[PDB]
Design brief:
Elements (H helix, E strand, L loop, with lengths): L5 H11 L7 H28 L7 H11 L3 H18 L2
The chain binds one DNA strand of 158 nucleotides through loops.
Length: about 90
DNA sequence: AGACAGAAAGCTCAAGTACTTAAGCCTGGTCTTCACCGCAAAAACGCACGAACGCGCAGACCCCCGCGAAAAAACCGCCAAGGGGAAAACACCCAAGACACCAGGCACGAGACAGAAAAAAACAACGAAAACGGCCACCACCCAAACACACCAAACAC
């Protein structure tokens, strides 16, 4: 039962485009994409942590990594989204 | 009132103490110039876990061989337009000069802010029980794959 991001990418698609489906080949592309972005961000956060002699990866490390990797408006909106989500989550 | 005496500062004259020098030149050799202090991190050896090792079974799936339809791939030929060569020329860039700027070097001052130290707690990891989200199995539906018709419209000729 080798695990994947499929259910979520289909949930998000159904939210943004209720009448649009997804081929298996394109679904594979999305899984690869998610995995790749995950590894870019986590790796940058790891480097940041090591440089500053810290042992925990917190939201600050992730935010900075996002700012370093995502170009322009992609970064600005991603940061907004991430901040909104961690705000909503802490205040439950 | 004055005359006598005693008590004074003074003054001088013997003991004790601090300080100084100690011939000129010359030749070799040997020895030594922070010592004792102790943390860093590279390393020794035991102990216990557990990750990877072995080996055995399952079967999935990769290799090989077969025949046919179909198409792309190979070969040949005309030829046109494109790559390349030669030529003009003009004004774009390099070169040389004189005058001047500001980069560079050194200096000192002030202090913002980086690195360290000591405290203190909120936050992450651990063990545990728990149940529901995400996976597999398998069904049915309809998007796009396909074939057949057709109108449309770019191409090139004149």
């Amino acid at each position: 039962r080798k695990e994947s991001y499929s259910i979520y990418v289909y949930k998000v698609l159904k939210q943004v485009h209720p009448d649009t489906g997804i081929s298996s080949k394109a679904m594979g592309i999305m899984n690869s994409f998610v995995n790749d972005i995950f590894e870019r961000i986590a790796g940058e956060a790891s480097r940041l942590a090591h440089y500053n002699k810290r042992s925990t990866i917190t939201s600050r490390e992730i935010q900075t990594a996002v700012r370093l990797l995502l170009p322009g408006e992609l970064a600005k909106h991603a940061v907004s989204e991430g901040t909104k989500a961690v705000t909503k989550y802490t205040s439950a």
